[PDB]
Amino acid sequence: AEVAPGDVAIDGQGHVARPLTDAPGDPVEGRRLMTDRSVGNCIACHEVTEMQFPGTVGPSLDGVAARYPEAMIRGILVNSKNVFPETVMPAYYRVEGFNRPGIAFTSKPIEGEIRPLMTAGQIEDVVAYLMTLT
Amino acid sequence: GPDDPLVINGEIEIVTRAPTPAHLADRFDEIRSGWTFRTDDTQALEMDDFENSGMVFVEEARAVWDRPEGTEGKACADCHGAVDDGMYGLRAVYPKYVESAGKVRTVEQMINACRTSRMGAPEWDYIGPDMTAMVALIASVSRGMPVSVAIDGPAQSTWEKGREIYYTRYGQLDLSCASCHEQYFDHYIRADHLSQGQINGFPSYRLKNARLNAVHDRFRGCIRDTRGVPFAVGSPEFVALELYVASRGNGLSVEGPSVRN
Numbered sequence: 313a314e315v316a317p318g319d320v321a322i323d324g325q326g327h328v329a330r331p332l333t334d335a336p337g338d339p340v341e342g343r344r345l346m347t348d349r350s351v352g353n354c355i356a357c358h359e360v361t362e363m364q365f366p367g368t369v370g371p372s373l374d375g376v377a378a379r380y381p382e383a384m385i386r387g388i389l390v391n392s393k394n395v396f397p398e399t400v401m402p403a404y405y406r407v408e409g410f411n412r413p414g415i416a417f418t419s420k421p422i423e424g425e426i427r428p429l430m431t432a433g434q435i436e437d438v439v440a441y442l443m444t445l446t
Numbered sequence: 447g448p449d450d451p452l453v454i455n456g457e458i459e460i461v462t463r464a465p466t467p468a469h470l471a472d473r474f475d476e477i478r479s480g481w482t483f484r485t486d487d488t489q490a491l492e493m494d495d496f497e498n499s500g501m502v503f504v505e506e507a508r509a510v511w512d513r514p515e516g517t518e519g520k521a522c523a524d525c526h527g528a529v530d531d532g533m534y535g536l537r538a539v540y541p542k543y544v545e546s547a548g549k550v551r552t553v554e555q556m557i558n559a560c561r562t563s564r565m566g567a568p569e570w571d572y573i574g575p576d577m578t579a580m581v582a583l584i585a586s587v588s589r590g591m592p593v594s595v596a597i598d599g600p601a602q603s604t605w606e607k608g609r610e611i612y613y614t615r616y617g618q619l620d621l622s623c624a625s626c627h628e629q630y631f632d633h634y635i636r637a638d639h640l641s642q643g644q645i646n647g648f649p650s651y652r653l654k655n656a657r658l659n660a661v662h663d664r665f666r667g668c669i670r671d672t673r674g675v676p677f678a679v680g681s682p683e684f685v686a687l688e689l690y691v692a693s694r695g696n697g698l699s700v701e702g703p704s705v706r707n
């Protein structure tokens with residue numbers, strides 16, 4: 313049972329207080345997703361020293377779990393723009409509003425239902441990984 | 447280094463840092479060639495044509511320039527003379543409003559207009575190797591001249607459309623050209639050092655794919671990589687975006703073909 317994109321409960325700081333799925337997050341798969349260039353590709357922008365050639369567009373995520381609560385970290389992943397308005401970080405659980413979205417990198421138009429960049433389960437896995445970063 | 451001088455062949459002075467164009471002054475303290483964001487080793491490859499693999503294609507196009515092609519049995523040179531004279535300055539002022547077309551045109555559009563209507567020859571694929579080598583030869587004979595594309599007058603609506611595109615978020619990653627090149631120049635995305643996304647050095651010889659890369663091919667690749675649907679090469683949208691991006695570099699020297707990652 314996953315909370316679908318339409319249904320997520322977001323407060324006014326953009327925090328998301330409950331998990332997006334009832335499946336427990338696996339931080340080992342989280343770690344894998346973050347450096348998977350096809351899914352998270354988070355290292356394009358973020359350094360995590362716990363974990364090559366990270367970008368500098370985003371802040372180092374070392375210590376992120378010491379500084380932000382889980383609800384805020386989950387909120388950043390559902391729709392970063394709710395937490396950091398006008399951020400360049402992608403919205404990983406959004407399925408509406410895109411201009412000219414394409415099917416991965418194939419340049420072909422997505423026709424019909426748009427799937428989110430990550431699944432609820434993939435998000436809870438990354439969140440579980442990020443929570444190890446104290 | 448970012449502030450070192452670029453001189454080519456010991457002879458051609460390249461302006462790689464310039465005061466920001468008036469229309470962009472709110473956004474940058476100065477404008478910079480992509481060359482200024484490259485490592486020293488890569489920077490050195492552009493300093494001598496003997497080390498710039500891009501110039502091998504230019505030398506090939508120099509021979510094409512004199513070769514009759516098409517049913518009319520003419521070569522470019524039969525009408526335009528020696529390319530060093532006949533094309534001098536042109537790269538610095540295109541894209542530009544063209545009298546006979548009542549529109550802004552790119553250099554590639556002009557070339558294919560001559561191939562078909564004056565040469566009786568096949569058009570070249572817009573971003574193919576034949577066209578991109580000829581556009582590089584045309585760039586190469588104006589190196590060191592300041593880029594000076596007009597942004598007002600009959601080009602105004604086209605430049606404005608280009609500006610709208612440059613700042614529109616595209617794709618499922620939801621990013622505009624400005625997201626990376628204006629807000630985050632001088633940062634890294636993975637191992638790539640973000641420049642201001644200037645095109646004064648095009649067509650670029652990329653060490654990555656070892657060929658010359660056309661402006662519209664770079665634009666198509668950037669929008670694709672937002673997980674997005676690019677506009678067609680040669681389309682009015684990319685012609686408009688080219689005019690506008692060219693104007694973000696007004697005052698830098700023509701550098702093409704440049705050497706880049």
Ligand code: HEC
Pocket residue numbers: 346351352353354355356357358369370371372373376385388389396398399400401402404438442
């Ligand atoms: C660049 C296009 C990014 C990608 C890809 C990812 N993130 Fe990001 N993230 C980015 C920026 C610019 C910022 C700072 C906010 C701002 O707009 O100024 C962030 C921030 C985060 C944070 C909060 C960290 C902190 O503020 O100290 C987290 C937890 C985070 N990002 C996570 C994250 C993950 C897991 C990603 C892959 C799925 C990811 N980001 C990609 C820019 C970019």
Ligand code: HEC
Pocket residue numbers: 511520521522523524525526536544546553556557560561564565580
């Ligand atoms: C005579 C039969 C020609 C041959 C062969 C080629 N070109 Fe040409 N070209 C010709 C004319 C009469 C004009 C002016 C047309 C106009 O609408 O302004 C041109 C123009 C160009 C341009 C634009 C030049 C400018 O000053 O802005 C370019 C870039 C150009 N021609 C390129 C070109 C090339 C690369 C050719 C060989 C493939 C070539 N021309 C042949 C006449 C003739």
Ligand code: HEC
Pocket residue numbers: 479480481483612621622623624625626627635638639640641642643644645647650664665668669672691706
């Ligand atoms: C971040 C995800 C980007 C977005 C959005 C756009 N570009 Fe980009 N571009 C990016 C990188 C990492 C690089 C390579 C390093 C660099 O030099 O910046 C580039 C390069 C270009 C270039 C080549 C620069 C040169 O040869 O000197 C151009 C002309 C360019 N990019 C244009 C461009 C445009 C017009 C975009 C919006 C359609 C755009 N880029 C978006 C990363 C990113």
